[PDB]
């Protein structure tokens, strides 16, 4: 049921999404090991992901959270990078997209820094890098990230290194 609509680079919506992507790049403590060495991206395409069923599934849960948190969904737009991005956009997020070994337990992880999510596009720690060149810092191969609507509700605050 999923259809992808291409946004024109002239569209304000392409432009605000690109700006979020570009402006939240940072340097990482691994000196680029997992995700490569870069300060910015070449954005090739931005598509709107449209699926009625997955959307209604999202807004149904959003209303439940909202109603348990004084009518505040605490909704954010956050990045997610994953080898499973094609399954995600067609079938939705589920437990197969979870990071079992993550710092805050077995759940689905999102980042405000696009460059943090970029570290997971080819797997945990960048895996073995791009399929074609086995290069975690490949400048040739096309990568994909998701920019996601995420309901946080009441969030447990973990101070952490």
């Amino acid at each position: 049921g999923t259809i992808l609509i291409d946004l024109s680079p002239d569209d304000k919506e392409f432009q605000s999404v690109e700006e979020e992507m570009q402006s939240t790049v940072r340097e990482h403590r691994d000196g680029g090991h997992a995700g490569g060495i870069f300060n910015r991206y070449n954005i090739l395409k931005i598509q709107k992901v449209c699926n009625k069923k997955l959307w209604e599934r999202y807004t149904h849960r959003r209303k439940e959270v909202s109603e348990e948190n004084h009518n505040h969904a605490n909704e954010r737009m956050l990045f997610h990078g994953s080898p499973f991005v094609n399954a995600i956009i067609h079938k939705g997020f589920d437990e197969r997209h979870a990071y079992i070994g993550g710092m805050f337990g077995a759940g689905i992880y999102f980042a405000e820094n696009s460059s943090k999510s970029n570290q997971y596009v080819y797997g945990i720690g960048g895996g073995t890098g791009c399929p074609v060149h086995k290069d975690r810092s490949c400048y040739i191969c096309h990568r994909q990230l998701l920019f996601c609507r995420v309901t946080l509700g009441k969030s447990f605050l973990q101070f952490s290194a």
Binding site: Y41, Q47, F93, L152
Partner: protein, 47 residues
């Protein structure tokens, strides 16, 4: 998949050493996120 701490719907990881890091977040229910945009890109080699 684990559970949110009791009385919570998510976890926020606040950065406490790397002063430039932004926050990271975890949800424990797939229905709490919608993949709104698919962004295709290349990282760029710095000059």
């Amino acid at each position: 998949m684990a559970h949110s701490p009791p009385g919570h719907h998510s976890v926020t990881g606040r950065p406490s050493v790397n002063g430039l890091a932004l926050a990271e977040y975890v949800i424990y229910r797939g229905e709490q996120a919608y993949p709104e945009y698919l962004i295709t890109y290349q990282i760029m080699r710095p000059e």
